[PDB]
Amino acid sequence: MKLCFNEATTLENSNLKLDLELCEKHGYDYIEIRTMDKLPEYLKDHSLDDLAEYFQTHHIKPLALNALVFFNNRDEKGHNEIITEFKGMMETCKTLGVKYVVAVPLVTEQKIVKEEIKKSSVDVLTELSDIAEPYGVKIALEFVGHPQCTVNTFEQAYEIVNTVNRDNVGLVLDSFHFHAMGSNIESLKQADGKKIFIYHIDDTEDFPIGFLTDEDRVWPGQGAIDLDAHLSALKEIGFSDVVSVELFRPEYYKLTAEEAIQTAKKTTVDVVSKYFSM
């Protein structure tokens, strides 16, 4: 199983250029590039071609572009924003050799029935799938374990992915998100491992579901998530490609970029290697 670094981990104490240098130095196989801040920042004094050249001449590679944000249940205008950004991301993926694009569900205060959320999500993901085919890029739907996210549990997200029924549409299983709204481990054990595109590892302070937010995450193994169960389930259903470490804790931004990157690697490897050869 390969090791990936998610830039949220060093959101406030690093940049893409430095993340690349340090992740490469510390043996990471992949990096998830953030499109809302890190990439634009990098492009202020660098070209996409420069970045493509970096990946061509180093071991590390870009696993995914992080988050096409709030893709479902949008009005005509919002849908246009979503499709326009996705099309732009396809060109970025092509230039950099990016394998996946992470899709994040709409976060809203509005109550929408689950079948309306499912129909919209399925329709949009199918449209995104159609667009992605000529690029060979795959979409990974990341359900978010937040009480205001329209798709906040594993089974709800899995139902959507299965209904879309496309080889280029799968899931991002994030341990924190799975734990944060109480997803059922039995549902994961009954899932098709091939539909799990990316696995995000992290842990959390033990607050009740509903109260948990991303700032509550802690290093893998230092929290209350039943990571033993998550890892055991992933192994049982055949998933084993890659694990990416993603943190949003203010405390860790106090560390240097390298300390954070090295700690993210040690905690992750020490936990994951107990189930998977790395």
Swiss-Prot record:
State the organism named in the record: Bacillus subtilis (strain 168)
Record has Manganese as a keyword? yes
Q: What is its EC number?
A: 5.3.99.11
Which residues are noted in the entry as a divalent metal cation-binding?
E142, D174, H200, E246
| Reaction equation(s) it catalyzes | scyllo-inosose = scyllo-inosine
Name recorded for this polypeptide: Inosose isomerase
Give any GO molecular function from the UniProt entry. metal ion binding
Q: In which pathway does it act?
A: Polyol metabolism; myo-inositol degradation into acetyl-CoA
What is known about what this protein does? Answer: Involved in the reversible interconverion of 2-keto-myo-inositol (2KMI, inosose or 2,4,6/3,5-pentahydroxycyclohexanone) to 1-keto-D-chiro-inositol (1KDCI or 2,3,5/4,6-pentahydroxycyclohexanone).
Q: Which cofactor does it need?
A: Mn(2+); Fe(2+); Co(2+)
Cofactor: record remark: Binds 1 divalent metal cation per subunit. Can use Mn(2+), Fe(2+) or Co(2+).
Membership in a protein family: Belongs to the IolI family.
Q: Which UniProt keywords apply?
A: Cobalt, Iron, Isomerase, Manganese, Metal-binding
Instruction: Quote the Pfam families the UniProt record gives.
Output: AP_endonuc_2
InterPro entries, alphabetized: IolE/XylAMocC-like, Xyl_isomerase-like_sf, Xyl_isomerase-like_TIM-brl
